[PDB]
Amino acid sequence: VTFKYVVKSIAYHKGYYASFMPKPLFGVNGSGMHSNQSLFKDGKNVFYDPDTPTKLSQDAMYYIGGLLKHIREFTAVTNPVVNSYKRLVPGYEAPVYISWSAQNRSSLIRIPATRGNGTRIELRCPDPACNPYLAFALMLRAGLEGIKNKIDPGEPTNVNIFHLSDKEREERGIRSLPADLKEAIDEMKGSKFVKEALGEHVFSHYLCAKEMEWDEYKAVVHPWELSRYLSML
Amino acid sequence: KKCTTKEDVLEAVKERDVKFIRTQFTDTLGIIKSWAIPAEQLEEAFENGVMFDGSSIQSDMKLALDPSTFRILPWRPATGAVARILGDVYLPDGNPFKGDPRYVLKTAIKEAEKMGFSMNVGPELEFFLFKLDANGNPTTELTDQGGYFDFAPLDRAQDVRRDIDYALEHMGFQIEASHHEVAPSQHEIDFRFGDVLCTADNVVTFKYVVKSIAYHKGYYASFMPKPLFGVNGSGMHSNQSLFKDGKNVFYDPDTPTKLSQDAMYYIGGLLKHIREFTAVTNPVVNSYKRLVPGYEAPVYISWSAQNRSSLIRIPATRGNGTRIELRCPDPACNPYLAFALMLRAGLEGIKNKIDPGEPTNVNIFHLSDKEREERGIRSLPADLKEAIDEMKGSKFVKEALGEHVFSHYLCAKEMEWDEYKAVVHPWELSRYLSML
Amino acid sequence: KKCTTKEDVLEAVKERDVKFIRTQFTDTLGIIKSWAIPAEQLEEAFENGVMFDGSSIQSDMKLALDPSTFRILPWRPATGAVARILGDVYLPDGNPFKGDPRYVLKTAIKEAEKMGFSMNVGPELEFFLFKLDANGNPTTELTDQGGYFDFAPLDRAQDVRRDIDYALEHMGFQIEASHHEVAPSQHEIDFRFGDVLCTADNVVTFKYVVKSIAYHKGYYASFMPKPLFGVNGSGMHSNQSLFKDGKNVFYDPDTPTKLSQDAMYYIGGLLKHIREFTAVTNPVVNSYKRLVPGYEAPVYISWSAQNRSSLIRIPATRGNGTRIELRCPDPACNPYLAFALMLRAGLEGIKNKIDPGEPTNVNIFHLSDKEREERGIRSLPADLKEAIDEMKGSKFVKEALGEHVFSHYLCAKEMEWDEYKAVVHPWELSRYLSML
């Protein structure tokens, strides 16, 4: 939180501008905020397990399973503004399919090769426009619930998901993130877990604000429509 | 002082108040890559190395810093000093990464050492100096209309050139000489002989040092092989020599030309294999607008002693200074790959005792096609596509560079050429719109 | 009315008050050449011919006018009517000039007649329609954003297009259909079948008639094979058929595909020899900017019946309408040389009973390089230099076109390519100035 406005103030005072828009320009990669996280108990890393072939503990597997199960519900929190979904499109570094992998670099959840106390889990969905407090709280709560419920994360996806076909994804059961802010809001509204975690007041206020923002956005006529249809029609 | 151990580097950082460290390395295509590290992290970096993304080169590898390559950049920000450092790339399992061009050059050096030879390279770097527009973007506006070795410029660009020279000297570069070049606003800088690895690192540093100075003084330094039509291009000639037991291998007082048989075999191997890595020596599309007849650039495969327009030229200097100059490369090339391929080709020529043939002393450009066919004078590839096609079928290049680098370089160059070949240039509109 | 004798031409000139007669002929490279003659000189010209300079084609020649080619141009200046006429070129000694493309086509027709065959060609010409600047110079601003077969334009450009169509009909062209093309501001016009000589003359007249109308209505008509990047180019497809004893040779009701063995041999010969005169069919550099994968332009040598992306296409029409369409040529080509080479290739295929191989009914662009190598799908020259290199070593093309035309065409194209290859395009500056 301090970093954001410190950087903005320095940029102004040196004559430039620093922007945190998830996608300011079309045709180039967007800006994201990956979150490396690790759980420590008794002063030692929980995730690290020297006895497993992948050097990852069962608790890490349950954590990944919980995150995969519940990410779709608070995708709205991790991507709060409309512009965030101009970044979550196929063809760039941003992930659009729900999967976890150890070697694939395009998966939603990536496990870096570092081990020992440096063992960590990276979630690549959030963008800097998100509120860090809510995002981190939801991440922690989802991981803890997954650990508690022994949620199995399933088999990792080591292939290029984008190169696959829709039939293959249906066969593998690979779900996708919400396409637009309205879909994310609809998914969040029915989520009992999100309401329980965030509390009634914050839940209701966030939903109302995002609903009003989307309603305002959906009724605008963009210059792209004029450029495409005015001569055609 | 020459820093040797990490303790010396830490002491120098503490003494001179260095605040940031810039790791330095290059990708396969020759672009300079770097990232910053705070001074306090330096001890941990020395102890354990730094993890980073290898997709910048070619996906997580560890960089192990080399204290012997520590140096301080020649500008003084108000906050503190700035320094750069180099290192080796290792895979997580601990094996070195074979995709690093520096590793390729090191393997070439080891291959040379297997036969007891060491290679010294002194390059001649050429560049332009253009003006910046009102928005600071690079342009092609000339700064002076001087000629070869002219005492120009004499306006503030003279101060810019002097500042560039002084900054390079302050880094311990030990420049031999610097002078104006044939084309307007073109300048040349020559480097002292040293080990090939240090020379390549110095060239890589030199490029961005010069560019940064040019920006900070209000100008632009360009390394394009041919930025303007109708004037000479920019090339990077490579003087090389092999040393055995501390003595120059090439020099032979008992021969009429004062050249040893080993030098003849080296030249023969270079002539045999130059076509297969011309693509590496000239990596961009614009490089082949420079390799056209009518200028200093060579387009015919030949070697000479007195004719200075040949592809390979032997300077009149003899004794310890005996050297062989290759005039094909341009500054846009990757120094590591180019030097490694040159050394490997020369060593292969030495091993197989390849005869370089008779030297060509007459002017080749004035000869006839039938005459060249009778003499068997081959030509360099005309365009990047031809160079790629020639390089693809070469097993020697593949085994010298390794499968990974070979495949990635070929794919990148093929994609670039495919993108270029489909563009409609304004020259076509100027010539054909009214005619057709 | 059909004019046959010179007396008919003189009577028509007197009746309709034609004040100027313009000769019409083309050089080796396809440019249209003409000069004016006063009406009173017409009788003397018919009696003795007109002397002129042969350097315009390739030096004193004599032109013998052909009264059967007399036509009146489709505009009426206040001064009086204007007419055009064609003829044969003769050397001073009386022998016909072998450097005339029309003579080449006539020799091809005579060679076909040796075996009793005659050819009918209906071409489909595509062109653009741009706006003129304030100074009346050709530019490249679009007039409409229509698509394939769209009912566009609807502004004054609609009136310009209608005027072009009406003038073409007025001269007696007998147009089949005219419609919008895929690219914006692109239009297509189709001709009826007729003897190849008359079709070539009609195309040559058509080009400058359309250009003149476009100027006089305030627009510009361009025949550049690819004036804009990212859109379809302009091509001139050639539908051809061979007739023997007044019947179509190609049509065979007994065969399952309703095609005769002669048609198969014709297609085989065309596929065999198309590579060698691709340079003639695509004479300018821009033509090979048009020939890139991803558009309607074909880049692979294949023939098909249902797939419409092949180089050679067989329309579903049968009977006397049976035809073979070749889709490589572009409007910038010389119709005489292209048609003559097509005829020669087809006849050579028929003589040797060349098998055309199995048709390709799949999408070639979707196949892999290994697949096409297994299928043996060869490819057209990528650039003008490759086409020139292929054409140089072609004995068949040399013997078909004659030594003089062959040598002059090769020299001109070689000079043009050499001039083009040394230019520095703004795309290179955009991509490389900042990066290097």
Dist CA B422 CA C298 (whole Å): 15
CB B144 within 8 A of CB B157: yes
Contact at 8 Å (CB) between B196 and B119?
yes
- Cα(C100)–Cα(B279) distance, integer angstroms: 44
Phi first, then psi, for residue C156 (nearest 5°) are: -55, -25
Q: Residue B256: is the preceding peptide bond cis (ω within 30°)?
A: no
Which chain C residues have a beta carbon less than 8 Å from that of A232? Answer: 145
A chain contacts of residue B92, beta-carbon cutoff 8 Å: 113
From A182, A211, A185, select the one nearest A74 (Cα to Cα): A185
B51 contact residues in A (CB cutoff 8 A): 112, 114
Residue C434, chain B, CB below 8 Å: the answer is yes
How far is Cα C149 from Cα C182, in angstroms, rounded to an integer?
Answer: 7
* Residue B153: cis peptide before it, omega within 30 degrees of 0: yes
Q: Kindly write down the DSSP assignment for every residue of A130-168, as one continuous string.
A: S-HHHHHHHHHHHHHHHHHTT--------S-TTTS-HHH
User: How far is Cα A101 from Cα A107, in angstroms, rounded to an integer?
Assistant: 6
- CB count in 10 Å sphere of residue B300: 18
Do the Cβ atoms of C73 and C85 come closer than 8 Å?
no
Residue B69 has which token pair? 């390559």
Helix axes C196-216, C156-171, angle to 10 degrees: 150
Paired tokens of C222: 């361009």
Structure-token match 């070689």, residue found: C414
Structure tokens at B386: 């031809």
C195 is catalytic: no
Q: On the CB side of A38, how many CA atoms lie within 13 Å of its CA?
A: 19
Q: Does A233 touch chain C (CB under 8 A)?
A: no
Residue pair B392/B410 in contact by the 8 Å Cβ criterion: yes
Q: How far apart are CA A191 and CA B224, in angstroms?
A: 58
B18-26/A40-41 β-pairing: unpaired
Q: Measure the CA–CA gap between A177 and A75, rounded to whole angstroms.
A: 7
Structure tokens belonging to residue A38: 């690790």
Q: Report yes or no: C283 and C333 within 8 Å, Cβ to Cβ.
A: yes
CB contact set of C419 (below 8 Å; sequence gap of 6+): none
Interface of C with B in 364-423 (CB under 8 A): 382-383, 385, 420-423
**B226 to chain C: which residues are within 8 Å by CB?**
424
Q: What are phi and psi of B54, to 5 degrees?
A: -85, -5
- The tokens of B405 are what? 């680098």
Catalytic residue among C170, C216, C308, C378: C308
Residue A14 touches partner B, C-beta closer than 8 Å: no
**Which alpha helices (DSSP H) does B303-362 contain, by range?**
335-352
Q: Quick check: B92 and A105 CB within 8 A?
A: no
Sheet holding C18-23, edge to edge: C36-38, C18-23, C81-90, C60-72, C50-53
B188 marked among binding-site residues: yes
C290 is in an annotated binding site: yes
Nearest by Cα to C150 from C119, C187, C121, C124 = C187
Q: From CA C302, how far away is CA A220, in angstroms rounded?
A: 51
Contact assessment for residue B236 and residue B229, using Cβ atoms and an 8 Å cutoff: no
Resolution (A): 6.9
User: d(Cα A68, Cα B78) in Å, to the nearest integer?
Assistant: 49
Shortest Cα distance from B234 to chain A (angstroms)?
32
Report CA-CA distances (Å) from B193 to B124, B166, C20, C115. Answer: 11, 19, 79, 77
What b-and-e string marks burial along B396-419, b requiring 16 or more CB atoms within 10 Å of the CB?
A: ebbebbeeebbebbbeebeebeee
| Residue type at C414 in one-letter notation | E
Residue of chain C whose Cα is closest to the Cα of A230: C145
What angle do the packed helices B261-281 and B335-352 form, to 10 degrees? 140
Residue C95, both tokens: 């022998």
| B296 annotated as ligand-binding | yes
Interface of A with B in 77-116 (CB under 8 A): 105, 112-114
Contacts of B272 (CB under 8 A, 6+ apart): B345, B349, B354
B59–A contact, CB cutoff 8 A:
yes
Residue window 269-328, chain B: list those with CB within 8 Å of chain A. none
Name the token pair of B248: 């120059």
A83: closest CA among A21, A159, A8? A21
Q: What's the rounded Cα separation, in Å, for the pair B47 and B49?
A: 6
B167 to A29, B133, B222, B426: CA distances (angstroms): 37, 25, 18, 41
**C43 annotated to a ligand binding site:** no
Q: Which amino acid is at B125?
A: L
Interface residue of A105, A106, A160 to substitute, partner B, most B CBs within 10 Å: A105
Q: Is C155 on the interface with A (CB under 8 A)?
A: no
Question: Which is the catalytic residue, given B100, B181, B276, B330?
Answer: B181
Q: Is residue A231 within 8 angstroms of chain C, CB to CB? A: yes
Pairing of β C303-304 and β C60-72: unpaired
- What are the angstrom distances between the C-alpha of A211 and each of A127, A135, A187, A221, C388? 20, 19, 13, 19, 66
Please tell me which residue of chain A has the smallest CA distance to C143: A231
- Work out the minimum CA distance from B206 to partner chain A, whole angstroms: 28
Q: How far apart are CA C162 and CA C180, in angstroms?
A: 12
Q: Report the distance separating Cα A68 and Cα B200, nearest Å.
A: 48
Q: What is the DSSP string of C246-311?
A: TEESSB-TTSTTSB-HHHHHHHHHHHHHHHHHHHHHS-SSHHHHHS-TTSSS--B--EESS-SSSS
Token representation of residue C380: 């057209």
Residues sharing a CB contact under 8 Å with residue C384, sequence separation 6 or more, in sequence order: C279, C282, C284, C285, C287, C288, C413, C416, C417, C420
- First-to-last alpha carbon distance for chain A, in angstroms, is 48
Breaks following residues of chain B (C-to-N distance > 2.5 Å): 58
Q: Which two tokens stand for residue B24?
A: 């330095």
For residue A37, count CB atoms less than 10 angstroms from its CB and return exposed for 0-12, middle for 13-18, buried for 19 or more.
middle
Q: Are C57 and C93 in contact (CB under 8 A)?
A: no
Residue of A114, A117, A119, A124 to mutate for B, most B C-beta atoms under 10 A: A114
Quote the tokens at residue A25: 């320009």
The answer to whether the annotation marks B348 as part of a ligand binding site is: no
C229 and chain B in contact, CB less than 8 A: yes
Neighbours of A68 (CB within 10 A): 21
Sign, CA dihedral A178-A179-A185-A187, equals negative
B-to-C residue pairs, Cβ atoms closer than 8 angstroms: 92
Give the dihedral sign, CA C400/C404/C409/C415: positive
How far apart, in whole angstroms, are the C-alpha atoms of residue C366 and residue C406? 37
**Which residues lie across from C317 on neighbouring strands?**
none
Q: What are phi and psi of B252, to 5 degrees?
A: -145, 105
**Structure-token pair, residue C54:** 């042969």
Nearest to C121 by CA among C223, C210, C206, C198: C198
Please, which residues bridge with residue C313 across strands?
Answer: C304, C325
C323, C123 contact by CB (below 8 A): no
CA distance linking residue C128 with residue C202, whole number of Å: 19
**CA–CA distance, B317 with B325 (Å, rounded to integer):** 12
Give phi and psi for B307, each to the nearest 5.
-70, 115
Q: Is C17 left (phi over 0), alpha (psi -120 to 50) or beta?
A: left
Cα angle vertex B330, ends B326, B332, to 5°? Answer: 145
Token code pair at residue C202: 């009609």
Distance CA A78, CA A95 (A): 13
- Which runs of E-coded beta strand occur in B287-431? 303-304, 312-313, 324-326
Residue C308 known to be catalytic? yes
- Cβ density class C98-108: b for 16+ within 10 Å, e for less: ebbbbbbbbbb
Q: Specify the 3-state DSSP secondary structure of A197.
A: helix
> B268 near B349, Cβ under 8 Å?
yes
Q: CA of C188 to nearest chain A CA: how many angstroms apart?
A: 21
B124 classed as catalytic: yes
Residues of B in contact with A105 (CB under 8 A): 55, 59
- Binding residue per annotation — C232? yes
What the block records as the tokens of B323 is: 């050297």
How many Å is the maximal CA-CA distance in chain A?
A: 69
Asked if residue C127 lies in contact with residue C223, where contact means CB atoms within 8 angstroms, the answer is yes
Pick the closest to residue C10 from C57, C98, C70 (CA basis). Answer: C70
In terms of Cβ atoms closer than 10 Å to its own Cβ (0-12, 13-18, 19+), residue A30 is buried
State the smallest CA–CA distance between residue B10 and chain C in angstroms.
Answer: 34
Bridge partners of B221?
Answer: B129
Residues C159, C165, C168, C174: what is their CA dihedral angle, to the nearest 10 degrees? Answer: -160
Query: Which residues are bridge partners to B37 per DSSP?
Result: B21
Residues of C in contact with B286 (CB under 8 A): 424, 428, 432
Which residue of chain C comes nearest to B286, CA vs CA?
C428
* B71: Cα separation from own chain's centroid: 20
**Interchain contact, A105 vs B51, CB within 8 Å:** no
Yes or no: say if C263 and C325 are a contact pair by the CB < 8 Å rule.
Answer: no
> What does the block give as tokens for C119?
């050819």
Beta-carbon contacts of residue C314 (< 8 Å; ≥ 6 apart): C259, C303, C304, C305, C324, C325
List of chains touching A (3+ CB pairs within 8 A) = B, C
